[PDB]
Amino acid sequence: IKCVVVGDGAVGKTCLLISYTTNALPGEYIPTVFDNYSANVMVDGKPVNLGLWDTAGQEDYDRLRPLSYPQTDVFLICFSLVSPASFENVRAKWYPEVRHHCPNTPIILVGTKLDLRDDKDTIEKLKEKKLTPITYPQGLAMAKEIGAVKYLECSALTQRGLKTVFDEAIRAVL
Ligand SMILES: Nc1nc2c(ncn2[C@@H]2O[C@H](COP(=O)(O)OP(=O)(O)OP(O)(O)=S)[C@@H](O)[C@H]2O)c(=O)[nH]1
Ligand SMILES: [Mg+2]
């Protein structure tokens, strides 16, 4: 099965795949040009081979990113639950660019950095920008908007809700 991970620069796409496959969060930040991980999971009582395609976040790779999209079974659209810009760009940039090349591929909306949503350290940082974190009901609505099959929230650090992301991704194609 083919799964493409798409979202704004520095939302936690890479981390979300490395923590899921290896159980270790990278201590340093290195921007993804392109990678290709895989994982053998057993769900629905079925042997499942899953290929995960990490992409780039910048507008630099605009016309080189869509190359990955053909022959895809399911998409993940990601955004930081702390970064509201990335929440906007779902509808603004990613939902257009995706449905443009693939108008049938089921989508799953994903709120990353779930641990930091309740963190007072971040809350009073974003307060200075007169902005709140994205509540669950808000993503729930953004999911309905872009016609996603599911909406899920997870932290790659604490691995909270992380298995489900890929449980639902597979369940979408099955
Ligand atoms: N607290 C917390 N921090 C996270 C989480 N996921 C990612 N981060 C932090 O955010 C930064 C970006 O992670 P990364 O996975 O590189 O994003 P990306 O979207 O893949 O990066 P890019 O390919 O668009 S340039 C990292 O420094 C990481 O420590 C998370 O679940 N919880
Ligand atoms: Mg990346």
Swiss-Prot record:
Statement: the UniProt record of this protein carries the keyword Glycoprotein: yes
Gene3D superfamilies: P-loop containing nucleotide triphosphate hydrolases (3.40.50.300)
PROSITE patterns in UniProt: RHO
Sites carrying sugar chains: 29, 32
Any GO BP: ruffle organization
Chief location of this protein within or outside the cell: membrane
Known outcome of mutating residue 32 to S: No interaction with PPP5C. Translocates to the plasma membrane; also
Organism of this sequence: Homo sapiens
Phenotypic consequence of residue 29 to F: Abolishes AMPylation by Haemophilus IbpA
Listed GO CC annotations: cell cortex; cell projection; cytoplasm; cytoplasmic ribonucleoprotein granule; cytoplasmic vesicle; cytoskeleton; cytosol; dendrite
Outcome of mutating residue 61 to D: In MRD48; increased substrate adhesion-dependent cell spreading; constitutively active
Annotated disorder: Intellectual developmental disorder, autosomal dominant 48: A disorder characterized by significantly below average general intellectual functioning associated with impairments in adaptive behavior and manifested during the developmental period. MRD48 patients manifest global developmental delay and moderate to severe intellectual disability.
Consequence when changing residue 36 to S: In MRD48; decreased substrate adhesion-dependent cell spreading; dominant-negative effect; reduced neuronal proliferation
Record Pfam families: Ras (PF00071)
Enzyme Commission identifier(s): 3.6.5.2
Gene: RAC1
Tissue: Isoform B is predominantly identified in skin and epithelial tissues from the intestinal tract. Its expression is elevated in colorectal tumors at various stages of neoplastic progression, as compared to their respective adjacent tissues.
Effect of residue 9 to V: Constitutively active. Interacts with PARD6 proteins. Increases nuclear localization and up-regulates transcriptional activity of NR3C2. Doesn't interact with CYRIB. Increases interaction with GARRE1
Family affiliation: Belongs to the small GTPase superfamily. Rho family.
Record PTM (Microbial infection) O-AMP-threonine, positions in chain: 32
Stated name of the protein: Ras-related C3 botulinum toxin substrate 1
Catalytically driven reaction(s): GTP + H2O = GDP + phosphate + H(+)
Positions annotated to bind GTP: 9-15, 28-29, 31-32, 56-57, 113, 115-116, 155-157
Membrane topology field: Lipid-anchor
